[PDB]
Design an enzyme around this catalytic site. Structure first.
Site, PDB file in Angstrom:
ATOM      1  N   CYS A   1      20.265  97.987  43.755  1.00  0.00           N
ATOM      2  CA  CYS A   1      21.243  97.077  43.658  1.00  0.00           C
ATOM      3  C   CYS A   1      20.713  95.773  42.516  1.00  0.00           C
ATOM      4  O   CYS A   1      19.559  95.248  42.714  1.00  0.00           O
ATOM      5  CB  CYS A   1      21.679  96.538  44.965  1.00  0.00           C
TER       6      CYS A   1
ATOM      7  N   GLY B   1      17.622  99.852  47.088  1.00  0.00           N
ATOM      8  CA  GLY B   1      16.793  99.095  46.390  1.00  0.00           C
ATOM      9  C   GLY B   1      17.046  98.670  44.834  1.00  0.00           C
ATOM     10  O   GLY B   1      16.571  97.996  44.135  1.00  0.00           O
TER      11      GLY B   1
ATOM     12  N   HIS C   1      26.126  90.580  47.667  1.00  0.00           N
ATOM     13  CA  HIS C   1      25.697  91.082  48.985  1.00  0.00           C
ATOM     14  C   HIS C   1      24.097  91.100  49.369  1.00  0.00           C
ATOM     15  O   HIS C   1      23.756  91.632  50.338  1.00  0.00           O
ATOM     16  CB  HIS C   1      26.276  92.578  49.110  1.00  0.00           C
TER      17      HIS C   1
END
Ligand code: QQU
Lengths: 301, 305
Positions: free
Chosen positions: A145, A143, A41
């Protein structure tokens, strides 16, 4: 003596954290040898998140669209491929700090350390378990991820989790390092909800054995139970069924303390019935379920 | 979202852990530049732990009695000196992995990360606080001595603790990196007991603000209190006195959540006299006191190292 929730030293993983930027999106990547692994993503916008066609979004990208930063050094992306929900960015430099490692997929109840990162910079390390509903009760902000979960056993880093999303209840969902999600989750901003969570019974029993090894015997009783009667009671408290594998896994702790697993199950039944009566077990007023039988043996005799 | 007990990344400290052996005693050392710091009780054996004149025992020792191991490499000791309860072993090689660092002495209530080691090998990292009775509720086994506590501020490792011993109640005692013990403890075989502990009030309040930031508001009330009325209540429940400095330190969290510090004190006053009523705060049935106001901000903002 002492019993703490303990994370593995994060040094071997810190030397692998990189920042991955694609357009406006900046998340974390895991740089191992000449490959940087990150959530796929990173190619999505917030609008793309509802129904993304990742293969359609990825085919439109070139190597130079992916900006990878290891400290103050930009890495050159020389290739890219997708494996499930993970993007694999081939880079021109092999990470010299790459430890001995392997990618392992864990089962619910298993514990691991999380190195939480923002912008390829590790900010904290904590310990947690894969819940029976396949979520983790993590501590993650925007942030984070691409932050990874791992275990370390004699110089080898077993990467088991990569953070991908936060669910509406505040819990977190992610994949193994092959990009396969834990649980029925998708990397879409569609209506997703974590299933009802349950207590990891084998872990609570392991933690009760750790309490006995540390001299806490107040909760023990003269009773025993059958495996079936234990599970009929356990189910009413939202406790995971205890399997014969769990009973076998608790064998070493049973032998060390002299308390049979089904006798320890009877103490647990009683604790669920009575509560703690203002008492604590290993400094805790709740029954702790994020220490596996292997963690207990590791940390205390 | 999420609130965990979080330690600082241990990498900068891992690159400093060495094994120190002298006679039969094996423990951990902290290798910074060309000096290895470790508990002075490494010179101790059977009669050395009972009546210990550490300078008299140390003057007997030659450099080659101390076997220092950094991984699979033995370091040669070229000198030795004692600073309080810490032995400083001058080695021939400066540690190339030495980070930017400083030695700091912390105050009770302050938190730090501990890298627990056995035989110069880091095995785990946990977060903990210096209790008001100067002990730490750590997790240590035999061989853990010399394990260090630290904080990270930017790229600078602030070494604040070195583990020396375990007290009869299972709690731990140690020194700052200058060898000065935290608390009324001595490094020897004698009757030592931790004093009665108290709850770090400013930390519980910080943790209540972290619960509010995480969407837990059930404990909030319309009430406020004076600092004096709160301190009369806190003293009854073995809680540390809340000072005006604590109130000031909680200011940013008060401004973020819209709950005045004395307004949150009234919530804590009610939790002390009425309990949690079967409810939890951040998955806890007890009031947590091992997160400082700074830890709450750092975790509920996202500061990196
Ligand atoms: O925020 C996401 C991913 C997201 C998600 O869940 N993120 C978060 C993760 N952990 C903790 C969080 C705490 C607060 C807010 C967001 C968090 C958003 C919600 O919907 C979904 C749904 C599915 C998935 Cl797999 C991902 C997400 N971003 C993705 C698209 C670009 C902007 C952006 C982002 C920028 N840098 N890194 C990612």
């Amino acid at each position: 003596s002492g019993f703490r929730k303990m994370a593995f030293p994060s040094g071997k993983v810190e030397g692998c954290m990189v920042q991955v930027t694609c357009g406006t999106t900046t998340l974390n990547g895991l740089w191992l040898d000449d490959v940087v692994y990150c959530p796929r993503h990173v190619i999505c916008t917030s609008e793309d998140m509802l129904n993304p066609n990742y293969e359609d979004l990825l085919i439109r990208k070139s190597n130079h669209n992916f900006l990878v930063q290891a400290g103050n050094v930009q890495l050159r992306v020389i290739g890219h491929s997708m494996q499930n929900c993970v993007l694999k960015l081939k880079v021109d430099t092999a990470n010299p700090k790459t430890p001995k490692y392997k990618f392992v997929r864990i089962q619910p109840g298993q514990t691991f350390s999380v190195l939480a990162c923002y912008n390829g910079s590790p900010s904290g390390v904590y310990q947690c378990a894969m819940r029976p509903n396949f979520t983790i009760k993590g501590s993650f902000l925007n942030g984070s991820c691409g932050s990874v979960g791992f275990n370390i056993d004699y110089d080898c880093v077993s990467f088991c989790y990569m953070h991908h999303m936060e669910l509406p209840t505040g819990v977190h969902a992610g994949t193994d390092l092959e990009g396969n999600f834990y649980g029925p989750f998708v990397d879409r901003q569609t209506a997703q909800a974590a299933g009802t969570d349950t207590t990891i019974t084998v872990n609570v029993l392991a933690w009760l054995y750790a309490a006995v090894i540390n001299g806490d015997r107040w909760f023990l009783n003269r009773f025993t139970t059958t495996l079936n009667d234990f599970n009929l009671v356990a189910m009413k408290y939202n406790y995971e069924p205890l399997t014969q594998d769990h009973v076998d896994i608790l064998g070493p702790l049973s032998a060390q303390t002299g308390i049979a697993v089904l006798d320890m199950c009877a103490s647990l039944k009683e604790l669920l019935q009575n509560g703690m009566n203002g008492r604590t077990i290993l400094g805790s007023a709740l029954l702790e379920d994020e220490f596996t039988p292997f963690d207990v043996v590791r940390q205390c005799s």
